[PDB]
Amino acid sequence: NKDIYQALQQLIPNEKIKVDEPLKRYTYTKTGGNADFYITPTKNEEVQAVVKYAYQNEIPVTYLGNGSNIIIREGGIRGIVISLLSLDHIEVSDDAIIAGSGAAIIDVSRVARDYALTGLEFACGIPGSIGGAVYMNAGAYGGEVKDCIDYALCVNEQGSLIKLTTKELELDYRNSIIQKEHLVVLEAAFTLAPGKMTEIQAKMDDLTERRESKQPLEYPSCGSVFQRPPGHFAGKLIQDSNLQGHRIGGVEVSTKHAGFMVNVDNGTATDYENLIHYVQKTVKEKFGIELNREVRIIGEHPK
Ligand SMILES: Cc1cc2nc3c(=O)[nH]c(=O)nc-3n(C[C@H](O)[C@H](O)[C@H](O)COP(=O)(O)OP(=O)(O)OC[C@H]3O[C@@H](n4cnc5c(N)ncnc54)[C@H](O)[C@@H]3O)c2cc1C
């Protein structure tokens, strides 16, 4: 690894490279082992240089946002982890808004309101970054990143810049082309419609109230873990299986929303995975229905 470190240092400012860095310090779930290399670029060129280098030497690269939609094993991640959290700009021009993939979508949603632009109120409570939102076509309460996005600037695994328009992004229900061909999102552009701020505020206020009353927003958490099985709702099945409150390590099935797994007591990525297995097993026994995992689990098992 000496070799990679030395090489990376030839390509990007040294202080932007952290070695054997515990990811639990940065993930929304507060879990995750060591990242061999944790890079925080402040420019697109730096992302390109790192991706090209990794491609050339076959080093796996993991793109990360706020970690609100993954579970990283306690063994950490082998290779290079690029955090896009510093690519945070948000700029508005009339009805258009551009934002770096590291910017919090909630921050962009709040900028939209500041300019009396309607169309992103649905995102006032979605955790994470713009890059992650694009990756999953994040959506809530009838809204989707897809409603107002024009394009997303990305870097392919070979290190080239590619501007993908709305159609090319192939935004779908909880999916996109970012997933299918491992591109890294650098920036997203939107076009919104002028609106009446008091009305924009009222919608955000209602959606905030609604979500707060239904979700365990006060605990680090991973959101909706399972796919929805035919004829039922995963959270309802889990609840009817009397799994709410069931804990393993420091992670338990939320007593506020059975579809959520909260880190209530310094839990680990291992607890999450174990609890998932246990929930799948308990439900299958009670209803004969098999819940399939929706949230990706990455990284290595410890030891
Ligand atoms: C309490 C709670 C409520 C939630 N509510 C909603 C909701 O209402 N609607 C909804 O859609 N989702 C929801 N989520 C899920 C989550 O917030 C979204 O999926 C979000 O867009 C993830 O952003 P992130 O920065 O946290 O991504 P991460 O968790 O850091 O990563 C997610 C995935 O995207 C990739 N990725 C991350 N950044 C980039 C990038 N720049 N380029 C390429 N790939 C990248 C990663 O490799 C990984 O596969 C909720 C989560 C929680 C904990």
From Swiss-Prot:
Cofactor(s) listed: FAD
GO molecular function: FAD binding; UDP-N-acetylmuramate dehydrogenase activity
EC number per UniProt: 1.3.1.98
Top-level taxon of the source organism: Bacteria
Gene Ontology CC terms, in alphabetical order: cytosol
Keywords from the UniProt entry: Cell cycle, Cell division, Cell shape, Cell wall biogenesis/degradation, Cytoplasm, FAD, Flavoprotein, NADP, Oxidoreductase, Peptidoglycan synthesis
A UniProt-annotated Pfam family: FAD_binding_4
Record's protein name: UDP-N-acetylenolpyruvoylglucosamine reductase
Species lineage: Bacteria, Bacillati, Bacillota, Bacilli, Bacillales
